[PDB]
Design a protein around this ligand. Structure first.
Ligand code: NA
Length: 271
């Protein structure tokens, strides 16, 4: 039975570690998790933080710093926003944005034009317009209109919900799930899908100076349908954080299925 991360790291050269619910909750950071990651890096383990945030990595880094995460706890951050930019560049350039103002950072440097709904040829969803007060039901009519126009829907964050301190907040994935249920086409690159894992692997291989075999990479997370499924499908061992909120595993009705959860190891919290 593993008591702490240190009981596993002799067998791995790198870690792909979840952020929300494991390192911080959007309002405070978790000192034991930070310390465990620091100790792993001190023993030569490369740490990639891999998160479904729709923001590009520099915004996630800045937010972590504001929450007290020291830069010596990780080597690099790879986000769903980072890899979603490749989908955005590939799709139609006249885009209807669904998400908040800060999430417009995902378009920086891309050859795209943000347009009104009636003008759009594609949709990019980073989140809800005001995720502190809105729910997926508020989007039913809009999603129906977009689906009837056969617009492709890029989802920049596969999570259904995320924690924000004590609250649960709806994410872009909830709107993507509703769009798919209407019969609409969705395009997704974050966990559990392969593109974010390939980006994390490119990051490790560049940092370590050569190929890193999958048997030498440990995935860590609290989402069964994101972190666990994603690592397993990419061929990585996984450490499941069993005491997490599992916010990404909540359903669009706000229910969590307690039978959700094969991880090589389980830890109540990253310590
Ligand atoms: Na998480």
């Amino acid at each position: 039975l593993p008591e702490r991360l240190d009981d596993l790291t002799d067998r791995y050269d790198a870690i792909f570690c979840d952020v929300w619910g494991v390192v911080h909750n959007g309002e405070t950071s978790f000192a034991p998790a930070i310390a465990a990651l620091q100790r792993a890096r001190a023993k030569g383990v490369t740490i990639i933080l891999v998160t479904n945030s729709p923001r590009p990595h520099p915004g996630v880094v800045a937010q972590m710093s504001l929450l007290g995460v020291p830069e010596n706890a990780y080597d690099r951050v790879v986000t769903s926003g980072d890899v979603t930019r490749d989908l955005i560049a590939e799709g139609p350039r006249r885009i209807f944005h669904i998400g908040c103002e800060r999430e417009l950072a995902i378009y920086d440097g891309l050859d795209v034009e943000l347009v009104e709904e009636f003008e759009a040829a594609g949709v990019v969803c980073t989140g809800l317009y005001d995720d502190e007060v809105e729910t997926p039901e508020d989007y039913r009519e809009l999603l129906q209109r977009l689906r009837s126009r056969n617009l492709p829907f890029i989802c920049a964050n596969p999570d259904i919900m995320v924690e924000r301190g004590p609250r649960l907040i709806w994410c872009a994935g909830a709107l993507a799930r509703e769009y798919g249920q209407l019969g609409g086409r969705t395009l997704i690159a974050g966990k559990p899908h392969r593109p974010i894992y390939e980006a994390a692997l490119r990051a490790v291989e560049s940092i370590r100076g050569g190929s890193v075999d999958k048997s030498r990479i440990l995935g860590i997370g609290d989402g069964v349908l994101t972190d666990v499924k994603g690592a397993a499908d990419f061929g990585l061992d996984v450490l499941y954080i069993s005491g997490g909120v599992h916010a990404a595993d909540y359903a669009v009705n706000g229910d969590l299925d307690m039978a959700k959860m094969r991880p090589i190891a389980s830890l109540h919290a990253l310590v």
